[PDB]
Amino acid sequence: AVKKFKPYTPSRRFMTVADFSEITKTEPEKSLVKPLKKTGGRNNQGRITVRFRGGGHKRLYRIIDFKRWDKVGIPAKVAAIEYDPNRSARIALLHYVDGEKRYIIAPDGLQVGQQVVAGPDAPIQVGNALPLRFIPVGTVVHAVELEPKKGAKLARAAGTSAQIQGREGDYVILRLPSGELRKVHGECYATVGAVGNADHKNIVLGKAGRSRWLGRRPHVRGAAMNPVDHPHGGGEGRAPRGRPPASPWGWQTKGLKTRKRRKPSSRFIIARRKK
């Protein structure tokens, strides 16, 4: 339930911070953090390759367990639910009966003090991870592997879900968060339930400085630039685009499809996205 502020400054008028009410542990597990090396959008030539990045709050990376078939059959207790600055979801700290501790993305409705488990035998309950071919059709699921044992790829942002549609040989069919229909190999793992922190989309930054805290430096418009810089540069006074709307590099940025036509995964996409 997003939190509001009284209009005691111009910015506090619309700023809305998360409620944080589901978090139960306010500092991370030390054996599971490592420094997150900030890039500023710069590659290994040192060139800017992704504009408008940098100056965000310092962060530590939480190591997240995107496999879980690591420890088939070994139950774990949900110890805490924590804040992660590297992702939109919350994370859940598991204390395995192994004595081993790990982090998963926290699904919706998971509770501290509960048991989760992984493998083909697992119950169909929020937080358990199974091979897709064993989850009943119709189930909502998250943290889905895309190829077997390569790691969870799909539906990991706050609030997202994938829904199992049907089976076909070694492949189930998923409705991804984008609305697309895809065949995903049945031996890929996945976790029952949707990701938590669904209210994440209703946060209102409220002011410029907030964006800066996230590492988002100000994005300047092409129409505001000069012809050396951009297809929309120049003109005396303001100007309409005067050409098909383009990127800084010239390609058209309204409708122009860009997925590679001959891409080999095409044989497993069933239906492009929606809306």
Applying the rule CB under 7 A, the residues between 138 and 197 that interact with RNA are 146-147, 150, 153-160, 163, 165-166, 175-178, 180, 182, 197
**Residue 20 has which token pair?**
């944080």
* Interface segment toward Mg ion; rule CB under 5 A; list 64-72, 88-96, 98-106, 117-125: 88-96
CB of 115 to Mg ion, least distance (A): 21
Decide: is 203 part of the binding site for RNA (CB under 7 A): yes
Give residue for tokens 């992984």. 118
Q: What does residue 171 show for φ and ψ, rounded to 5 degrees?
A: -130, 130
Instruction: Point out which residues pair with 116 in neighbouring strands.
Output: 76
Q: Between residues 134 and 225, which has the closer beta carbon with respect to RNA?
A: 225
* Residue type for position 263: K
Decide: is 267 part of the binding site for RNA (CB under 7 A): no
Find out whether 97 and 76 touch, Cβ atoms under 8 Å. yes
Q: What does residue 224 show for φ and ψ, rounded to 5 degrees?
A: -80, -5
Q: Which of residues 66-125 bind RNA (CB under 7 A)?
A: 77, 83-89, 95, 97-101
Rounded to an integer, what is the distance from CA 153 to the centroid of its chain? Answer: 9
Q: Of the candidates 22, 24, 54, 120, which one interacts with RNA according to CB under 7 A?
A: 54
Residue nearest to Mg ion (CB): 41
Signed CA dihedral, 258, 263, 269, 270: sign only: positive
Q: Between residues 98 and 130, which has the closer beta carbon with respect to RNA?
A: 98
